[model samples]
Target: GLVPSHMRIALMQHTARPLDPQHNLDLIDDAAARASEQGAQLLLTPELFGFGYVPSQICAQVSAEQVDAARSRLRGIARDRGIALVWSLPGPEGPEQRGITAELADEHGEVLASYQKVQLYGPEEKAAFVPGEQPPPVLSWGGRQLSLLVSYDVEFPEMVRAAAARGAQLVLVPTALAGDETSVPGILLPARAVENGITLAYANHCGPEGGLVFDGGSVVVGPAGQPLGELGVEPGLLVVDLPADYLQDRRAELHRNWL
Candidate 1:
């Protein structure tokens, strides 16, 4: 055959409760195990997967120690399962900082890279968490380079290009998306993939939590803007195989313009 370029990825979709970190973590572990059983090498969870996308009022109640505890739990799971795990959390990286979007852990449970959310949403996110200065760099795993931009980060063309230019062949998106469906997975995601000429895997939350509805349409798209697979507004797994040569070919042919 083609000698598979890299590992297969699984996007897990679920519902999150506000301010419930333990519950969310447990759910993620269950989902990860399921994906691994289905032959997935990596599992991508939704944004704020730890705290359930709690607003400022409730998020303020979460302590720094609690956040650390959750992260430790996730790391342990990756170590135990031997599967690469990708998820987002609100972090107090420093004294002044309150929140950051981080992606780490290899298949062997080794820490790889952590990136902060460069583009914070409106006052809701700004008040709820501290925004970082830059996005994460491209990460290499299973013979392919990958990276992640938070929920709203990929909506902007510049943000997607920044990651692509830095040598990312695949982008993992952890989103708490809400509102219209057609605008999001239908329009925005494909545009980002086609424009950047890289694979984009999006994992989103479902149902209403913390008084806000989240989009549950998790999907994977190829560099050519072709749909690989998708999960509707239900809690499930969307797994797909990504060939490294697909990205290389796309970049060589149509790697131009962030728009």
Candidate 2:
């Protein structure tokens, strides 16, 4: 309730299929519509949610031409629904390393901001995506500092801390994780928000699609290092407030002036 009191936001928590772009888009639209109806101005979705999240297949089966054309399709949803959107798509970095870019689209369907994932996961992920040159930049939205971070990139406490150091108030994380790891969400989510004094919103998928169990627990943690909202292993939506001064009071209190 301490938020700016004017801006509203939401995150999509869904199980995305690894090969069906249409289905995923439909899922996106469905969530967007519902979020809009429920009074959410921005909607964040899972990582690589557009193409079902198969790295190798996305490289082999998808084409730049196809992705470019599909941009309009996605933009259309943003335009029609009147909800700002954040999602990821596989991008070409080099002959070997192709990283995924998290794009922020305005309600008009035009990309307003973008950030590439610097840390590519283990060998399987490394085989397809390249390492990002740097961390995500903080952008402005709804009178706040906004940044986008991928799944693993957020795992590093330093990476998130850096964003906070750069004046990020709200970090939108689009993630695809599986296998029931409770520690990350339970411990890390709130820790990241509290330590950095930022509003952290993570939208993860029920994934690990091919021979994988999804660690699907989506949550929004406040600057007080508390969960404003949390989700289970099922499809859901998390709509929460992003205060105008997300960490103002807390930051001054926690900041070590002597050290």
Candidate 3:
């Protein structure tokens, strides 16, 4: 095992339900508190976690003021607990855009960055939210640059490579994929880490939500594409202490030119 001199992060896989924002927010707060207690400097939650993954058509019925109010409450929880939080919410952007995957408050409870989903998942998303124009990249956190990508974003190699090229040391992914994609963490996630030479932490939803059953396969992979510990398939915190030097070593030993 290598010595660690980098940030310690925890990925939280929140259980989402259909149109149940209040319950889900409560769960998120509880999870954040627990992760903080475990010494996790940062916590990443699932996509569309605020109001559940209702289709864009239905989400359009949700008023802008209402969504903003919900986000304020979630942000308050992060501030109150003194933990950095990342979660997604139904954005006010028009129908052409997918909802934003926002990175809320730092460990000190200050809002840092917010990214809109660049790629829409399907007709449901396409009709509901605006697709982001900007690309997702690493953001500064506790003196380290941490990158974040939403659910389907991890399946694309170009996205991961782009974040890696931006000097991202760790990539935080929040997914609500179906149970059929259970092999993603075992296959694609490691491949992304190995190819990009960065650590990847994925937090996916568990149980049924909006008629979709999530596989709940959360993981934290190292720079060499090796997992720091075992992959988790339940609802909990997947914590890992990553070494800053791991990326440097991998860049020296296994680095490759991006095609």
Clashing residue pairs in candidate 2 (N, C-alpha, C atoms within 3 angstroms): 3-243, 4-244, 18-52, 98-130, 118-132, 178-215, 179-213
Q: What is the lDDT of residue 189 in candidate 3?
A: 87
Q: RMSD per prediction, one decimal?
A: 4.2, 4.5, 4.5
lDDT of each: 0.80, 0.80, 0.74
Top of the candidates by lDDT = 2
Candidate 1 local lDDT, 1-259, one digit each (tens): 2225457888889888777888989998988888778778889999887888875753557777877888888988787777899878767553236765767687778878787888888888877777778756897787888897888887887788788878887888888887745687888889888876788999999888777777788999898888898988878888888774433455533445533
After superposition, the stretches of candidate 1 with alpha carbons farther than 4 Å from their true spots are 1-5, 94-96, 244-259
Pick out the ten consecutive residues of candidate 1 with the lowest summed lDDT: 244-253
Q: 1 or 2, which is superior by TM-score? A: 1
lDDT of 1 at 193: 89
lDDT of 3 by residue, 1-259 (tens): 1325556677787577666778989888988898778777788888887777676534656667767777888788888877888888876544334365666577666778777777778887776776777778678777767887887778888788768778886787777777577567888889898887788887778777777777777788887888885444567777777674433455533445634
How close to the true structure is residue 130 of candidate 3, measured as C-alpha lDDT? Answer: 66
230, model 1: CA deviation in Å? 0.4
Model 3 score (lDDT): 0.74
RMSD of 1: 4.2
Full candidate order by lDDT, most accurate first: 2, 1, 3
